[PDB]
Short mmCIF file of C-alpha atoms in Angstrom, two decimals:
data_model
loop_
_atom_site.label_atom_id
_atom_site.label_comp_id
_atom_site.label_asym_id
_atom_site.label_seq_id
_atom_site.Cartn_x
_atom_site.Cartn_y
_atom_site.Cartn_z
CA UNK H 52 6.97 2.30 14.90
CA UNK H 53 8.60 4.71 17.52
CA UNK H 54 10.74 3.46 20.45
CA UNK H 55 9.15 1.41 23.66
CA UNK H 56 8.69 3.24 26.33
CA UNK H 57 11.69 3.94 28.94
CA UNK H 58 12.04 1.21 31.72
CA UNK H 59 13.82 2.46 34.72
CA UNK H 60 14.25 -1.10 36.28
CA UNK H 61 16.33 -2.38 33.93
CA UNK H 62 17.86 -4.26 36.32
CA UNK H 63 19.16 -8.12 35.98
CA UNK H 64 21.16 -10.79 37.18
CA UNK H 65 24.55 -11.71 36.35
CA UNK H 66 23.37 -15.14 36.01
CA UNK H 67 20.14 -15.07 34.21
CA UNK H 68 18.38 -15.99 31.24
CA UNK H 69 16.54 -13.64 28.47
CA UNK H 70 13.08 -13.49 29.30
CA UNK H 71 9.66 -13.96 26.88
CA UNK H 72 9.43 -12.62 23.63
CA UNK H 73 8.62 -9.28 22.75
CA UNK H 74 6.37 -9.32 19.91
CA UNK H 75 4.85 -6.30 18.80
CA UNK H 76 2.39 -5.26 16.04
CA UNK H 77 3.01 -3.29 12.62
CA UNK H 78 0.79 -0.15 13.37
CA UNK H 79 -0.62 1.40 10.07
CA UNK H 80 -2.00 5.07 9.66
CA UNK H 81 -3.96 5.43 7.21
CA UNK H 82 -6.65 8.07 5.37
CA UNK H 83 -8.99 8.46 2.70
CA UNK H 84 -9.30 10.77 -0.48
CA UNK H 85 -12.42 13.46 -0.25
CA UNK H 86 -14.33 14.20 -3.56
CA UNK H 87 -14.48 17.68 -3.75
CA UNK H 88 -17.43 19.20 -6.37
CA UNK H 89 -18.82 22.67 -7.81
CA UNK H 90 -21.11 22.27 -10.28
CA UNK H 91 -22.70 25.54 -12.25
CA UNK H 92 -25.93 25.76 -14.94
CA UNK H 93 -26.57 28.36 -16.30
CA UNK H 94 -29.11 28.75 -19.33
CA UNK H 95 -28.05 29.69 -22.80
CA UNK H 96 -30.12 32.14 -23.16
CA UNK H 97 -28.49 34.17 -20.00
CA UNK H 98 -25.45 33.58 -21.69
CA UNK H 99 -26.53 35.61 -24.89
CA UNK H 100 -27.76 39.06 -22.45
CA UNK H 101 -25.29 41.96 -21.58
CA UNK R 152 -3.46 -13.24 15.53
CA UNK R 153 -0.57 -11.08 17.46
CA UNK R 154 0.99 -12.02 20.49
CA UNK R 155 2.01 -15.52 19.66
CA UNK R 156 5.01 -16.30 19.33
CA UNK R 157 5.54 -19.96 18.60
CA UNK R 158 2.22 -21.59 19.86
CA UNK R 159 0.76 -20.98 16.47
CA UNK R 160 -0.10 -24.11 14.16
CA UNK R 161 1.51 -25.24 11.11
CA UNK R 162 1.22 -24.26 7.36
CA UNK R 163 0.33 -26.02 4.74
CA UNK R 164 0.64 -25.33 0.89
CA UNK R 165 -1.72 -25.13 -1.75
CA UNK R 166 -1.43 -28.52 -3.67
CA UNK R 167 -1.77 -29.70 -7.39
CA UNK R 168 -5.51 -30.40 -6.30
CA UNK R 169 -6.14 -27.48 -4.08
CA UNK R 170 -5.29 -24.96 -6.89
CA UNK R 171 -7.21 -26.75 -9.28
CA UNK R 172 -11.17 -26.24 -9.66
CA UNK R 173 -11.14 -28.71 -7.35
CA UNK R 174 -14.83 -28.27 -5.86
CA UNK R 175 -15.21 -28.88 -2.27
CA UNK R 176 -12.86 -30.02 0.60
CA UNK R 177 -12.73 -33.80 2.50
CA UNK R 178 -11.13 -32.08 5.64
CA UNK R 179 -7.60 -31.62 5.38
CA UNK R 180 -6.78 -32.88 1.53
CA UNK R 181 -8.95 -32.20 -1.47
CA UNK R 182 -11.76 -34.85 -2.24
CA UNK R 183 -11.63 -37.00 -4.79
CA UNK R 184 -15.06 -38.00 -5.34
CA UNK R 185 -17.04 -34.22 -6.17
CA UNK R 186 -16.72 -33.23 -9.79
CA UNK R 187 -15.21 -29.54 -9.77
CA UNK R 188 -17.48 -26.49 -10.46
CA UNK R 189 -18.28 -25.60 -14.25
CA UNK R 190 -16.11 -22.50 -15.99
CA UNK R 191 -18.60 -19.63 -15.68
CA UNK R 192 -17.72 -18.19 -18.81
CA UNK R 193 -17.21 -21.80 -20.51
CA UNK R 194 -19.19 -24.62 -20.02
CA UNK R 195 -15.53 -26.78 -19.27
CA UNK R 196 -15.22 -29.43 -16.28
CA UNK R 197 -11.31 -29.58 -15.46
CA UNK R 198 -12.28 -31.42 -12.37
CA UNK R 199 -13.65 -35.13 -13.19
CA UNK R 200 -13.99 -38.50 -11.94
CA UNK R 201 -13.54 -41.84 -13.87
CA UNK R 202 -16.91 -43.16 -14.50
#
């Protein structure tokens, strides 16, 4: 929700009234999780050599 | 829905009906005629109408 942007004409009356509103939204960021996987098979009978 | 300020319309709360099993809406209140929907996992009616 960072700061508005700078307004060089910020210039009013002595005499005035506040203008409109100044309704602005709620910005979200937002991300996801990745599923990360390594799968290994390797027969038993590999398993059993030298 | 942003950007109004005021012009939005009013609110309204969830009545003794509304959060009931109240089964189907006559516009703005709850009817009073349609029997409420059956309990899936029971077979119960909490919703009735005087016969």
């Amino acid at each position: 929700d960072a700061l508005a942007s700078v307004d060089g004409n910020n210039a009013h009356v002595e005499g005035s009234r506040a203008e409109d509103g100044e309704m602005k939204p709620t910005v979200i960021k937002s991300n996801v999780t990745q599923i990360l996987r390594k799968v290994v098979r390797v027969s038993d009978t590999a398993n059993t050599t030298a | 829905v942003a950007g109004l300020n005021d012009t939005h319309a009013a609110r309204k709360t969830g009545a003794f009906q509304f959060l009931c099993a109240h089964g189907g809406l006559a516009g703005g209140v709850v009817d009073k005629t349609k029997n409420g929907p059956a309990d899936p996992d029971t077979g119960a009616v909490t919703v009735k109408v005087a016969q």
